[PDB]
Design a protein around this ligand. Structure first.
Ligand SMILES: COc1ccccc1-c1noc(C)c1C(=O)N1CCN(c2cc(NC(=O)c3ccccn3)c([N+](=O)[O-])cc2Cl)CC1
Ligand SMILES: COc1ccccc1-c1noc(C)c1C(=O)N1CCN(c2cc(NC(=O)c3ccccn3)c([N+](=O)[O-])cc2Cl)CC1
Ligand SMILES: COc1ccccc1-c1noc(C)c1C(=O)N1CCN(c2cc(NC(=O)c3ccccn3)c([N+](=O)[O-])cc2Cl)CC1
Lengths: 437, 437, 437
């Protein structure tokens, strides 16, 4: 209760700083309120402050509504001027947390937009491990929030890139310990110790990490999920009279759903693009939901969340070689029917629950039919690698996680009355090579 | 023909005795016809005669409609008086068969109502073996009818409880021989001999029995299924002018379906309970259908037979600490669209049928699509334990049993025109831990 | 372009010869145009010319409409007279290609009508390998077109029949080389060499061939598919003014679809038979589609192509002991909504594509549900026989073949605008023994 109030205070301070920074940048650039709430403008401004910290100038495309048409202009700012605007919006401090928050939003968007199969094959990883690749476009030396948000496969990928002096060993051991904390079984954690304790890591460590990544498809790791929104949402809220420091804020509770319910974000739309599909993409990004079950996402949103291959849309960002005369703008539908708490858990990994159910029928009636039985489960019952294999063999796609937990009405602020839903799952399952759904 | 007439005669005598006993008890208790046909009253009266044979008094709750409300009263009878009423309703004889018949009805209800996962984990058994647990609430020393009705897993459970002087060996060998007769493959039967022939049975016998139980999920055993109805149904039929001795009776033919079609049973309903769900529960119990494919049960009944976890109902029996002022009564819908012969068979166990079908496609047209193939079947082709494993590996959920046999119209008394149906299967498949359906 | 023109020329010559032959036979027999376009008459005439080449007389049932009824008459022709009529319709030449073309049509019909499970069990083959049995009713010494059209399992079957002097060795090695050319992986081809190089082939070669046949269910071979129509279709087109020599013709392009769109074929219908089901059977035969995915066939045809066990129809040919007074005739619906190029390819066999997708989810929200993952795929990653096993283990029913290729509008003659469809698959999957669909 008091610990939550304290967390909400610091998060609320962070969000307030991003908001004031964005308001300042909008006034500097003389953008209208609508233009300030165009997501492409928000991404440019976010990129500029990140570039300023992460000639000595930074910039990008800024889009204005001029004479009934959308116009693109490349603006340039001194990196030192941007740094001063950020620091002073955050009351003198560097506020690295706000920067990392915007990085995670960018990361969550990239996770929803692009598949990193090229990066995966380069590191010797299965391109089908995408659900483990949360935060893979984040830098290696990210923040505490960045490390928490990164998937098991992202950590594996970064660790193999290390394998392929004194500061290199500390970085290697730190990343092993980050990965270890994500694993929910002792057997997986022990294998990470065996990789961490390796003097001169090589092929044996590579193989162990690939093994661990594949185990995390079934024995999933604890990855944090944070709803991180474009800076324009925070800026527009601060400007309109919302005080994030007095109200507090949460990345995992109702707050971001309530905030999106009271916001209006815009997007540039290419010809032949569906705005609803652009909306779905950004909504998924907003709630870090790229690798979620599409059934869960659909039920929360209230409209079908379709696979990536069914979306009639390209990326949010507009390339510099694209024609602006064919560009239209529309509202992004970023609201939801319900809301749900964002989890750090990877679900159940305990295979010794002595779980109750039914995996066969016994015929009562003399009637022609096939006799259903759960083959893989029945047949499954017949050092650390072999234990992990056995734990994976015990697991079933049917096994239920998050028991008793449900979605909530937007009016249910205290999360008192959970709605447990009656349950195509893979967002990246629909491509020209695989029909995984 | 003559053997069937002889069986129908003895069964008809048994049913007549139960009927006359129940009529007598209803007059003793001064119950109205409606009250006599309340299933909770029937269960109490059934329990009293079973307790009298299986201070020196027996009793239970009897429910009466008094001043527009349902009232509960605890009655007590001398066990000797009940025994005299039972014996004399059965023309002087002990009639142990009628008692066992009522026990099987109770067992079939328990199988439909409760899952015995606690009893299973105590004996070292997988709680998912529930479909093998028919008759598990029956006493070890039941009747011939009780032994026939018991599932493979029930026999395994009882045998492990033995493992955990001269009369103990005979009981052990008898139960091994009961189990052996249920198995349809020689390899399974041989393993039971190896368990039976064991001097000082222990852990090796325990492991063999667990192995055999799991094999019975695929290579299913021959378990008898008997439609055993509450005593009020038999009593109401005898009273109304049906002579079971002259007509004969069958537990596995059309008779019980015809009887339920001409009967009206009632149940106490708690607030917020669906009467149709209470009806489904009792209908399943009546025809020993707890562990049947829900598709088969649905097609016969004519209405959807949903999983236990979807039923808005608790048990039939009302606890002594429940409030009677909130209790209502309603008719139990125990009729069916069709009827079907109850089987003793566990389906096909012969894996050497050289069965015809198709497990892959060959592309004819140059069109983008996935290429379907039956993976587990294709990959499967690459002493007694290993043979059983191999037989289990050969089996498929798609394989058809009871070829040429179908359901029947209620008017089709001779079962001349079988309706073969075009075929969620697990009744206990829908819980907070597993979504098996 | 020039190679295609050359192929179209020779194929067009072949089709023209069959057409002129059939016209001649119709005039000889004094059949009306409608009677000539009855498929049963076409099959008899086709059989007669094949028998004449493959006392010294040949014949069969010819059906005429006489006095409002269908009448059967057994006609007999001198085999030498038929041979002269065929040769002279083909401008003096033997034209063995036209004969083989009619044989393939007969083969494609047999593949759609009958399952050869008896022939399969006699050769030690799995009756479920039917999808590999294209061209199994064709003679061993068929043509070049006959060899190309034969399935992997057909070649295996013929090779085992050889196993069960100098000319026998050449025939054995030729058939091994035919089979080898069908395999798309080097590992499969190498095993065929090891069977071919065997002095005195026996049980070891038998086992290798059974292994190879089963591998072809997953690592499918390159089998040719040719749309071969009843001779009455070609005859009716030539008679109506279509010049196949000037227009050219193709067995794998749009031509046969265009030809069927401009044709009208009839069939004798038994009482209680659905004409639409008779139509489906002949349509499948016409396009060599017995072993295709029923989803692909359905989408092309524009109406549901149901499994064989759902078809209310027997074979096309009428037995000599059947009553003609109950026979009716109807139009065969042999048209299609779309068309598609017939392929020689067996789909993708390359398991090293580093294919992109998703085989698990990572939970974002704290909500009760099961957590989907692709079990067989995840678990799969944990000399020539073992490599083939490993390649089979890598394959998935979800993997996509023929990428970028689609169906076409009947008006799209050049195949410029492919329609890729959004994808019950087995035609022989619905029987009393197996529910494979
Ligand atoms: C209650 O009204 C106000 C409240 C505050 C300020 C102005 C108004 C206000 N003044 O005038 C009108 C009109 C107003 C109004 O109705 N709204 C709608 C809600 N809205 C808003 C709400 C939330 N959060 C929660 O409510 C919440 C509730 C429970 C837990 C966690 N969070 C967040 N957030 O969580 O980020 C962002 C926004 Cl923008 C603020 C404006
Ligand atoms: C044919 O009518 C009678 C028949 C007998 C007694 C009275 C009547 C009768 N007297 O007046 C009316 C009115 C009556 C009447 O129509 N019914 C409905 C059927 N019913 C009934 C039927 C059966 N069985 C079979 O019919 C059967 C048929 C074929 C095989 C196996 N079993 C069972 N049984 O099997 O347990 C219980 C009952 Cl209660 C008896 C009363
Ligand atoms: C364009 O019209 C004619 C054309 C020719 C002869 C007579 C007529 C004609 N004279 O009067 C009328 C009226 C006519 C008419 O409209 N049709 C319909 C089409 N039909 C027909 C078409 C084809 N093939 C293609 O068109 C094709 C197109 C592109 C690639 C491959 N093949 C085939 N074939 O491929 O086997 C069989 C037949 Cl029977 C011939 C008669």
């Amino acid at each position: 209760r008091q610990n939550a109030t304290e967390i909400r205070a610091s998060v609320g301070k962070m969000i307030d700083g991003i908001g004031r920074f964005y308001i300042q940048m909008c006034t500097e650039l003389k953008l209208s309120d609508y233009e300030g709430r165009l997501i492409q403008n928000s991404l440019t401004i976010e990129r500029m402050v990140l570039s300023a910290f992460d000639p000595k100038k930074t910039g990008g495309p800024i889009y204005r509504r001029v004479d009934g048409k959308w116009r693109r202009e490349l603006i340039l700012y001194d990196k030192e001027e941007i740094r001063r605007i950020w620091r002073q919006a955050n009351n003198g401090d560097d506020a690295t947390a706000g920067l990392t928050h915007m990085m995670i939003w960018h990361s969550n968007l990239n996770d929803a937009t692009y598949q990193r199969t090229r990066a995966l094959v380069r590191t010797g990883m299965d391109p089908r491990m995408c659900s483990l690749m949360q935060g893979s476009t984040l830098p290696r030396r990210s923040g505490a929030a960045g490390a928490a948000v990164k998937g098991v496969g992202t950590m594996v990928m970064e660790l193999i890139r290390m394998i392929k002096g004194r500061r290199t060993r500390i970085a290697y051991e730190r990343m092993c310990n980050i990965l270890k904390g994500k694993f929910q079984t002792a057997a997986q954690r022990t294998m990470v110790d065996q990789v961490r304790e390796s003097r001169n890591p090589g092929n044996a460590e590579f193989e162990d990490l690939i093994f661990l990544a594949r185990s995390a498809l079934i024995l999933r790791g604890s990855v944090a999920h944070k709803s991180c929104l474009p800076a324009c949402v925070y800026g527009s809220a601060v400007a309109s009279g919302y005080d994030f420091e007095r109200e507090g804020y949460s990345l995992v509770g109702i707050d971001p759903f309530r905030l999106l319910q009271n916001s209006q974000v815009y997007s540039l739309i290419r010809p032949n693009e569906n705005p609803a599909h652009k909306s779905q993409l950004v909504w998924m990004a907003c709630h870090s939901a790229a690798f979620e079950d599409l059934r869960v996402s659909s039920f929360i949103r209230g409209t079908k969340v379709v696979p990536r291959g069914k979306l009639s849309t390209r990326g949010v960002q507009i390339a510099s070689n694209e024609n602006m005369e064919t560009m239209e703008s529309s509202t992004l539908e970023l609201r939801s029917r319900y809301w749900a708490i964002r989890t750090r858990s990877g679900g159940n990994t305990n295979q010794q629950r002595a779980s109750s159910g039914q995996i066969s029928i016994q015929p009562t009636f003399s009637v022609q039919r096939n006799l259903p039985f759960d083959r893989p489960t029945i047949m499954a019952a017949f050092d650390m690698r072999t234990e992990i294999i056995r734990l994976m063999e015990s697991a079933r796609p049917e096994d239920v996680s998050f028991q008793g937990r449900g979605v909530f009405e937007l009016s249910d602020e205290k999360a008192t009355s959970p709605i447990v839903p009656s349950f195509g799952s893979y967002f990246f399952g629909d491509n020209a090579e695989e029909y995984d759904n």
